[PDB]
Amino acid sequence: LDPNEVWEIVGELGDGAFGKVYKAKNKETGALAAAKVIEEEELEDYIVEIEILATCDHPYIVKLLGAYKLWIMIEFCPGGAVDAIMLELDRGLTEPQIQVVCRQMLEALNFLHSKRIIHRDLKAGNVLMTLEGDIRLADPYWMAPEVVMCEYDYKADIWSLGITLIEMAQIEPPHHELNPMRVLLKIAKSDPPTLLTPSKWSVEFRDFLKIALDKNPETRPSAAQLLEHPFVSSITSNKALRELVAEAKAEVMEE
């Protein structure tokens, strides 16, 4: 069952810091793809991840297309990642644009959390866009108190979400100016990040971030509970992202 007859590569989309990501078009049917390509130990570690994605079939999570070196064919999303969008446009996202992403993310998180799965790498570079204006998420008594805590556990996502929303408002996440070494300390030491210009955004945004970014995963809310927040409870149209995908395409056409 050799590949290359099935798919033909027709582009490169981004050498991240994990393999390289190329664009693939089906030889028979004509369909597009994203091909992630790698080449004992690691191989079985990747198979588990692949077989986890097959399971995670939902509107707002990339579809697994196949598995043939090591090829992984995932759905082409022709808007690309939101962080790439934000630079090509050289600006943040409008609150209504942020409202639509926050809500679609929450349905993806709430889905995953019912499957007992965490994402753990939620940032703007892992929120992809379709032309339709929709997102896809990508890729015992002698025990010491601190050992106990590190054995609710899926509230990690909910923190990354609120942090992703700041990334989208402001282009850059909080503490972007310090090196990765010092970040971890700043995270653990500092109070929950707020928006830089509280004046610029609605009272609902500020409060959503207030409750999303609780340092205590006990008192911190589920994807489910957050879906009833005013900030995302009234959101029925993907218009504002339909709008934003259009500009991005237009801006990209420039030469």
Ligand SMILES: CN1CCN(c2ccc3[nH]c(-c4c(N)c5c(F)cccc5[nH]c4=O)nc3c2)CC1
């Ligand atoms: C600079 N202009 C805007 C960004 N540009 C762009 C265009 C299409 C793109 N598709 C993907 C993509 C993934 N990166 C991807 C992944 F990383 C993991 C799993 C599935 C994926 N599917 C994709 O469809 N990125 C794109 C970027 C290049 C042109």
